[PDB]
Amino acid sequence: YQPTPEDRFTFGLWTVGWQGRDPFGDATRRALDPVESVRRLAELGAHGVTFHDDDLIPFGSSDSEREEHVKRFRQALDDTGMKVPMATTNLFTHPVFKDGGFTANDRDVRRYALRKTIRNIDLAVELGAETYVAWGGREGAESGGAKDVRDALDRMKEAFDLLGEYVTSQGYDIRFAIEPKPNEPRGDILLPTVGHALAFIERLERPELYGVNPEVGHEQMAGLNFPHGIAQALWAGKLFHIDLNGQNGIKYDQDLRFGAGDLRAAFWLVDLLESAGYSGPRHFDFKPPRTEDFDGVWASAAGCMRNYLILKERAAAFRADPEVQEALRASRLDELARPTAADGLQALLDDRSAFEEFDVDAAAARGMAFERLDQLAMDHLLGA
Amino acid sequence: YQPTPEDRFTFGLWTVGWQGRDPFGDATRRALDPVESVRRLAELGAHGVTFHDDDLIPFGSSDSEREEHVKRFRQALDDTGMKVPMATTNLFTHPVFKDGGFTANDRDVRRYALRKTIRNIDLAVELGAETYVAWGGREGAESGGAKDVRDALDRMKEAFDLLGEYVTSQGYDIRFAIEPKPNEPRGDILLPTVGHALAFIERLERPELYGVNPEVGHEQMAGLNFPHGIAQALWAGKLFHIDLNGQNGIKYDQDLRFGAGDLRAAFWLVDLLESAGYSGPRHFDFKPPRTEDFDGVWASAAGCMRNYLILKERAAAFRADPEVQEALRASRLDELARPTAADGLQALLDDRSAFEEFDVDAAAARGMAFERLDQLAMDHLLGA
Amino acid sequence: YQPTPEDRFTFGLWTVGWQGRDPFGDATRRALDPVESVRRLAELGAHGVTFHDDDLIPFGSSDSEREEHVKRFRQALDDTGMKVPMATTNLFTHPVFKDGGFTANDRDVRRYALRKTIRNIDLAVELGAETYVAWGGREGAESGGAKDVRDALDRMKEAFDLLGEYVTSQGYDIRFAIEPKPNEPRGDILLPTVGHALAFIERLERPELYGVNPEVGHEQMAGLNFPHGIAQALWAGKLFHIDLNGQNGIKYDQDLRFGAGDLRAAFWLVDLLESAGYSGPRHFDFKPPRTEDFDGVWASAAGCMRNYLILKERAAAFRADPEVQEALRASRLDELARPTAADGLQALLDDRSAFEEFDVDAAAARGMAFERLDQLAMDHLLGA
Amino acid sequence: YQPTPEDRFTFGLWTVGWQGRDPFGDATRRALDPVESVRRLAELGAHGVTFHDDDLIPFGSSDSEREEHVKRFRQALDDTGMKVPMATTNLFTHPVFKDGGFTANDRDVRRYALRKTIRNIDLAVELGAETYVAWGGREGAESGGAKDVRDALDRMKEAFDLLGEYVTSQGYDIRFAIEPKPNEPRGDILLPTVGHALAFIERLERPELYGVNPEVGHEQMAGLNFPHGIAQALWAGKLFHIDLNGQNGIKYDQDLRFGAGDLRAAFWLVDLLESAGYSGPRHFDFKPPRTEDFDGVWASAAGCMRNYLILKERAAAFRADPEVQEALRASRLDELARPTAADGLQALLDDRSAFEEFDVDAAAARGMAFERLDQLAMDHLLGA
Ligand SMILES: [Mg+2]
Ligand SMILES: [Mg+2]
Ligand SMILES: [Mg+2]
Ligand SMILES: [Mg+2]
Ligand SMILES: [Mg+2]
Ligand SMILES: [Mg+2]
Ligand SMILES: [Mg+2]
Ligand SMILES: [Mg+2]
Known part of the structure; x- marks a missing residue:
């Protein structure tokens, strides 16, 4: 599960650069030079970085300091191949x-x-x-x-x-x-x-x-x-x-590393993104917990990408499994994708099988078989 | 605080008609004839009633039973002046x-x-x-x-x-x-x-x-x-x-009577509806708690309308209070309603007072005076 | 991952027997005879069943009907080896x-x-x-x-x-x-x-x-x-x-099958129960979703037990992994289990290394290494 | 609604002294000298102040600076009559x-x-x-x-x-x-x-x-x-x-001024505290929103005490209202306070009126009249 730049993983400067100040505590880590963040992220396998203006150019900077900061940043991008x-x-x-x-x-x-x-x-x-x-x-x-x-x-x-x-x-x-x-x-x-x-x-x-x-x-x-x-x-x-990122429920914004928080929601997210062919960046807006030193910052960043890649493998295995494909048909996901009334309004109105002679009790008795489908999803996620 | 039909209050048949079945318990009240609900709601001062198809015509009813049910319902509407x-x-x-x-x-x-x-x-x-x-x-x-x-x-x-x-x-x-x-x-x-x-x-x-x-x-x-x-x-x-209706936070759908639940949100809602000139029905989708007998059902329904009318009076008093009007100007609600840049894009770009010579520290020091405004709102809500 | 009665799995009669009535809908399944539930649960590998009085003996039953119902139930327990x-x-x-x-x-x-x-x-x-x-x-x-x-x-x-x-x-x-x-x-x-x-x-x-x-x-x-x-x-x-059971956050009581809902919380629960030597029943209080027919009911019940057994295996592998054991020491879980001051109050008061000469800045700089430990936990849960 | 020291209102130094730093923003207010906070709170009618060690004596202070800080603080307490x-x-x-x-x-x-x-x-x-x-x-x-x-x-x-x-x-x-x-x-x-x-x-x-x-x-x-x-x-x-303080639901800790957030919960809290004879401090742990300047800080602090006193008046009026006292009896709050079985276990077992000859259907039909009681509570809170 090693990331490549073609996995399109990106991080904000403010993520690995978060010093750990929270509403009740002082910073636990020193400031990171944006140039060092670019190089460390490049070595982890990221494709690029993102920034707020004030991450790169401290508020109130003179126009000369601004030009110097951008030039150092641009050189780090050139040195590493990282994109913005x-x-x-x-x-x-x-x-x-x-x-x-x-x-x-x-x-x-x-x-x-x-x-x-x-x-x-x-x-x-x-x-x-x-x-x-x-x-x-x-x-x-x-x-x-x-x-x-x-x-x-x-x-x-x-x-x-x-x-x-x-x-x-x-x-x-x-x-x-x-x-x-x-x-x-x-x-x-x-x-x-x-x-x-x-x-x-x-x-x-x-x-x-x-x-x-x-x-x-x-x-x-x-x-x-x-x-x-x-x-x-x-x-x-x-x-x-x-x-x-990850979040454990309705509370303050935790910005946990991706994969943490609601794991099954992360699985269904990756399934959707990959099935839909989303081609944009996979951006992590997370905060390494302030319990961590700088080695923990890079371990947390690495885990973002690792968890995406593990889930990508498991979701792909889920969708490719012939028993899952049959279970999807058993639950009528195929029928959900078919138009309700491509025959049009008046044909629907004249269709006695849609109302007058529709057997509601036979339709109601048909199980949806969703629990078997979901346990196949669970088994695949867990590699079981 | 007595409602009139011109207050546009409406209730669903399924509201006062809720028999009290919940996921863990049997019904605590007998079924209400829709005709009786129309007449009792009319006497409370409601303007009209709403219905689901299955509230009025039980599922599977023959076309003859359907016509009889509608006719009885229409006669109750004619007898009471209630609208649908x-x-x-x-x-x-x-x-x-x-x-x-x-x-x-x-x-x-x-x-x-x-x-x-x-x-x-x-x-x-x-x-x-x-x-x-x-x-x-x-x-x-x-x-x-x-x-x-x-x-x-x-x-x-x-x-x-x-x-x-x-x-x-x-x-x-x-x-x-x-x-x-x-x-x-x-x-x-x-x-x-x-x-x-x-x-x-x-x-x-x-x-x-x-x-x-x-x-x-x-x-x-x-x-x-x-x-x-x-x-x-x-x-x-x-x-x-x-x-x-009313709701106490993130939990199952309580459908409490209006005014219950988040009282200050109800005050700001009525303030908005009346200030914006909303002219549609004021519809209550609430459930009288299953602790209640039929006298409690009508007391709960009455309280919906009473609470709207009390809040309407207090919000009107809030907006008309000259000290509130001055506090709104103190908090620059007047400036919020003015366009940011009616002078246009290029004038904004050329405006040195908007960036180059903007005194951020003087602007930052200006208090918003929101807490005084909110306590005036509290005093008015409470009649204090 | 096949359950045995020695896994101590139990189910309530009201779980697989839930007919699917919710606050907004009629039952989607017929009633289950408690005798049939006992036999079907026995075949899935459960150890026993639990009951409310009204599950077994309908409210208002005569004393003779009560004795007949208990006798039929007792015979099913004897026939299957199931316990209560x-x-x-x-x-x-x-x-x-x-x-x-x-x-x-x-x-x-x-x-x-x-x-x-x-x-x-x-x-x-x-x-x-x-x-x-x-x-x-x-x-x-x-x-x-x-x-x-x-x-x-x-x-x-x-x-x-x-x-x-x-x-x-x-x-x-x-x-x-x-x-x-x-x-x-x-x-x-x-x-x-x-x-x-x-x-x-x-x-x-x-x-x-x-x-x-x-x-x-x-x-x-x-x-x-x-x-x-x-x-x-x-x-x-x-x-x-x-x-x-399982639950997706702060909302109505879902009673999903165990393993659904918060998967990582289920992993840490099983880890705790097995590490602490909890010897009581592993009871499932869940509701098969009302989308399901009776085959889906048994699939959902089976999945409860399967998910416990999968998580039990993964938690055991986590605790037995030598790299996890070293990571736990790296995060000082060993020190958490040692008394703070077995030397006593007065020795703590006289200990200059505890205050006067404690180097707070050196202590503060020590990373907790929790993110590496948690990613090892994630890898083990996912079999990665 | 003017507070007196006998109302036992207290504030933390860290409340009015909060400079407005939150997880996403710099401080919007300058630091308050604890001596000035004591005097300003005394003029508002507070009874006393509370502190964390680090509020009064900055972390790392020499023992001489510590003694000077305490002495200045003690003099402010003596000058104002404020307690700790x-x-x-x-x-x-x-x-x-x-x-x-x-x-x-x-x-x-x-x-x-x-x-x-x-x-x-x-x-x-x-x-x-x-x-x-x-x-x-x-x-x-x-x-x-x-x-x-x-x-x-x-x-x-x-x-x-x-x-x-x-x-x-x-x-x-x-x-x-x-x-x-x-x-x-x-x-x-x-x-x-x-x-x-x-x-x-x-x-x-x-x-x-x-x-x-x-x-x-x-x-x-x-x-x-x-x-x-x-x-x-x-x-x-x-x-x-x-x-x-006040809080609007399940989210980050807002520390709004008391009365804000859930207003009806604040009413029932004051009702309980005053009815139970709670004699401890009425302490406000709140944060003046960082939108506010120092005049807004004191307005927010004043509003804490004002809202308690308004609610105290309304709860007292509620409990003293003869129509509320009759409604409480109508809802059987008097019976809730009577022992279930002061006659003892064996008398309960022998009491055929408790089971064998208890008319469950007559008991079930009795409405609890809770909605009328709650609307009386609403009317009293709102002064309606
Ligand atoms: Mg966030
Ligand atoms: Mg973001
Ligand atoms: Mg609702
Ligand atoms: Mg509705
Ligand atoms: Mg439950
Ligand atoms: Mg339970
Ligand atoms: Mg708090
Ligand atoms: Mg507190």
């Missing part, structure tokens, strides 16, 4: 963003947020990124009166429309992906799930430029089925990117 | 629907589900209903392999498209509203939240015919902010109907 | 228990509940049961004023004390196990977790007669770590019995 | 505690944790504290193999037993209160609820010295009923202290 497929903006750490970026109540902050984002889109394009992610972590509220959500959605649409006008006018070949999260650090965050993000995109002026970047743990913080949500995103043609 | 603004299909109780209706794996069941629905659309139109609700309670899965969600969404789109073709071809003036629920009775239900439903509607052939019927408790079963979700539905122009 | 290690009372289905049994507000109901329980203790002892389980499913409330919880705990203590006096006075060799559940069917249930049950037991007059019967899914309905709770129960010497 | 009823240890912020204090795998860390705690017990006693709180925020795990929970409970018992030996040997009049939390910052925290803490205390060598310090938001992070848990703690005689 995705970038994002930090609109959440600095105190100015305490009430949001694109939907801050203060108009001057919203303008500043847009200019900060546009500056990093230029840099992302320069470094070859194909997707630009927006996680509106501070867009939301702790109390009901603080945010008129209709006005806030107007402002969010205005911001994304302006960003689309910018990339269109510059001729950039980059697309946007909205990353939903239900809560944390705000009490409730706007566009809290994949569904809300997908719905919002359809109201943008140029919807074809926007998709979603769902994260395993975020949908699970709402108790939702992550593979189901990914299926809906794929169905809509909007899965532009994906963030892989 | 909404109707729905029961595609969840009968065993034939154990794997769903519109997305059952068995094709013959899906055809039967559509014919059962179409028959009740005709009846709903006959009785004057303006909205037809679809709650896909059995559409979903308990295990990963049982349902290919992309194929299931294809089937769900096919079913709703066929329904839209039906109403269009018949010239009916009725619209559809999808009611999301995250889980129960299926392990995960398709279109689990308002967001997922809104996103799905945009892929239908005639999206203007479809909106959402969100329910307080259902979004709270995902830990989501119900007023936020309603705001997004209103923002999209898709709030066709609404189901009011 | 546990029994319980149904104090939740009949409408008289709508506000509880032992803590119903009505005093006459509480007396009736106790007499119904005592009658079944006599039967359980006659059939050889060693543990008597109490699940107070109706003890609780939907609203705050309905139940004074201090008075209700007084009544619950009174009931269990009377039961202990009964078994002591009759010389029975049976013990009691309280089964906690946080909610459903009541809005909140008294003694909602393993912890609350353990704490309550210490206030009973004869605490040695009472322990807990924790259920996987119930603790997970509170988002708790089930292996952690079992460890505390074992630590207290109170794990008298255990209910195994 | 409770103190606690910070065993969670410094990196050395990354795997816990009392249950760290490393033995030398556990010894250091005990010495750090003992040093602050001496200081707490010097300043007049009656309760010493232990919140084991780092005791727990993110993965299953990292912590043997039985060994960890052995170590936790060893630590608390040693602390009890210390206070007994020094003749101190101080008691201990364990503060449970289910998760955050560890993936799962040991003793996650009030129940688990109560159960653990009964295994300590001197259980009379230990009780619980439950926090509103912590029990709600497990979806539990906080008033129910407080009732069980009072029933056990173990409510030594209480932490008041």
Whole structure:
């Protein structure tokens, strides 16, 4: 189970670089030079790295320091063969963003947020990124009166429309992906799930430029089925990117390594991604637990990729097993894929076998055989 | 706080008519004749009632018994002045629907589900209903392999498209509203939240015919902010109907009377509905607890309407209070409603006050004054 | 992975016998004769069965019908070699228990509940049961004023004390196990977790007669770590019995087959039970999904036992792996098992290496190596 | 609704002093001098303040700086009349505690944790504290193999037993209160609820010295009923202290001001505390949202006390209302407080009215009238 760059595994600088500061504790690890992270990730078999602007260029850096930082970073990419497929903006750490970026109540902050984002889109394009992610972590509220959500959605649409006008006018070949999260650090965050993000995109002026970047743990913080949500995103043609990690239920955002948390959900996710032919990066947005030293950081990163590859093998074996293929037919998955009424509305209305002479009791007695199918899935996952 | 029919309060037959059967217990109340429910609800001050087909006409009824049941029902409506603004299909109780209706794996069941629905659309139109609700309670899965969600969404789109073709071809003036629920009775239900439903509607052939019927408790079963979700539905122009009740957190669907459960969420909901000018029915989908006899059923129903009217008064007092209006300006809710960049993209790019010469530290130091605003909201809710 | 009676697997009559009635649907399966369930479970490799009084003898049965039902049941046990290690009372289905049994507000109901329980203790002892389980499913409330919880705990203590006096006075060799559940069917249930049950037991007059019967899914309905709770129960010497099933997060009680739901929690549970030498029954309290016919019921039951046996093998391989044993020492699990201060209080106070000259920065820099240990656990679970 | 010191309101230094650092953002407020917090809280009407050792004396302070800091603090207490009823240890912020204090795998860390705690017990006693709180925020795990929970409970018992030996040997009049939390910052925290803490205390060598310090938001992070848990703690005689705040459901620990979050749970909590005659401090462990400047900090603190006093008035009016008293009798709360069988076991067995001639159908038909009682409670809370 050794990763190759053709497995398309990517990591954020802020993942292995997380120093371990949490709401109740100081950092347990020293800062990582982005250049060292690139080289260590390259040796593990990753395909590339992603960044927030403030990960690479500390806030307030002079334009000269900014150019020096980018040059060192570019040299590390050249030295390693690593790519930068995705970038994002930090609109959440600095105190100015305490009430949001694109939907801050203060108009001057919203303008500043847009200019900060546009500056990093230029840099992302320069470094070859194909997707630009927006996680509106501070867009939301702790109390009901603080945010008129209709006005806030107007402002969010205005911001994304302006960003689309910018990339269109510059001729950039980059697309946007909205990353939903239900809560944390705000009490409730706007566009809290994949569904809300997908719905919002359809109201943008140029919807074809926007998709979603769902994260395993975020949908699970709402108790939702992550593979189901990914299926809906794929169905809509909007899965532009994906963030892989682990989460144990409805609680704070754990960002465990992928494979940890809900293991069977991870199996069904990989099954779906591989069956659907998802060709984007397999990006890990995880945090090595602050119990770990730097050797544990690399072991945790390695485990992300290993667990994906193990699950990929087991899901492939599941789908290729002739007894599973017969069980799928026994459960009528083949019939689910057939149109209900390709014969059309009036033929359905005239079809006495669909109502007047339909034997409901015979249909009701047919078992779905789902439990046998699921135990075959369990046996394959466990190698049993 | 006495309701009038002009308050637009409606109840489902299945609400006050719930006999109290739960997964662990027998019924504690006798069946209610729909005619008696209409008259008792009329005396409480309700504006109308809603029904599933199987609430009014027991499953398997002959066409003659069906006509007799409708006639008795129509006479009760005429006797009381009660209206029927909404109707729905029961595609969840009968065993034939154990794997769903519109997305059952068995094709013959899906055809039967559509014919059962179409028959009740005709009846709903006959009785004057303006909205037809679809709650896909059995559409979903308990295990990963049982349902290919992309194929299931294809089937769900096919079913709703066929329904839209039906109403269009018949010239009916009725619209559809999808009611999301995250889980129960299926392990995960398709279109689990308002967001997922809104996103799905945009892929239908005639999206203007479809909106959402969100329910307080259902979004709270995902830990989501119900007023936020309603705001997004209103923002999209898709709030066709609404189901009011109470829910205490992430657990089984409690269907408590409205006002119970999360009281402050109920206050912010009423504030939003009244401020936005929502003109649809205020529908209660609640269950009188099975601890109650029939006098408790009517007390619980009365409390639904009373709590709405109390909250309506308190929210109106909140918005009209001059000290609240000044606090809203102190928190810059006025600035949230102003466009970020009506001056346009290039002016924003050339605006040095938006980035180069923006004083981030002065902006960051400005308190949002949200806690004072929220305590004014608390004082008004409590009459303090 | 074939079960033998020496694996101590047991099932409730109400598990494979569940007809599939849920809050929104009719039964999908016919009733099972308890005699047929005993024989089918015996053929699958189970060691025994458990029952509620009302599973075996329908409510209201004459004393003659009761004797006939027990005799048929006893003959099936004799024919199959099946044992009855546990029994319980149904104090939740009949409408008289709508506000509880032992803590119903009505005093006459509480007396009736106790007499119904005592009658079944006599039967359980006659059939050889060693543990008597109490699940107070109706003890609780939907609203705050309905139940004074201090008075209700007084009544619950009174009931269990009377039961202990009964078994002591009759010389029975049976013990009691309280089964906690946080909610459903009541809005909140008294003694909602393993912890609350353990704490309550210490206030009973004869605490040695009472322990807990924790259920996987119930603790997970509170988002708790089930292996952690079992460890505390074992630590207290109170794990008298255990209910195994699966649950996907905080939602309604799913009662999925064991192994489904949180797979890694199931692995750590089996690891703990086998390492601690738990010698009680491995009881499955699960519901075959109502999608299933009777062949699916037996496949689901078989999968309970299969998944336990697979996990038992993998946990044993984990603990026996020399690289895991070295990793445990690397993470200082050996030091966790050593006393902090067997040298005593005053020696600790005089130990300058414990404070004055303790190098906190050297200690803080030591990685815990937990992520490498957890990936070894993952590899072993998956057979990788 | 103006607080007086006789209302016994207390605040932690770390509450109004929270600078607003969260997992995703920098501090939004400057540090508060503890002396200024004491004076500002005194002017709001608080009775006293609480502290962690590291709040008052920064980690690593020389013994001379420590004496200067305590003297300045003592002078502020003398100047204001403020008391220090409770103190606690910070065993969670410094990196050395990354795997816990009392249950760290490393033995030398556990010894250091005990010495750090003992040093602050001496200081707490010097300043007049009656309760010493232990919140084991780092005791727990993110993965299953990292912590043997039985060994960890052995170590936790060893630590608390040693602390009890210390206070007994020094003749101190101080008691201990364990503060449970289910998760955050560890993936799962040991003793996650009030129940688990109560159960653990009964295994300590001197259980009379230990009780619980439950926090509103912590029990709600497990979806539990906080008033129910407080009732069980009072029933056990173990409510030594209480932490008041607000929380919106199962998510990260919000620490909202008291009254926010679940408003009706706050009403039933105050009802219980006042009816039971709880005489301990009313302590607020809350965080002013980081959106706020220092004027918002004091408004949030003021709102804690105001909301308690409003709810106290409404609960008192509820219990004193003659129509509520009659409704309580209608719901048989009076019968709940009467013994089930003060006549004894054998009389219950001989009582034919308790079983043989009990009319279950008449009993089952009696409504509990809980919904009318709850709407009276709602009307009183809202002043309607
Ligand atoms: Mg995350
Ligand atoms: Mg992410
Ligand atoms: Mg509902
Ligand atoms: Mg509804
Ligand atoms: Mg269960
Ligand atoms: Mg059970
Ligand atoms: Mg807290
Ligand atoms: Mg606290």
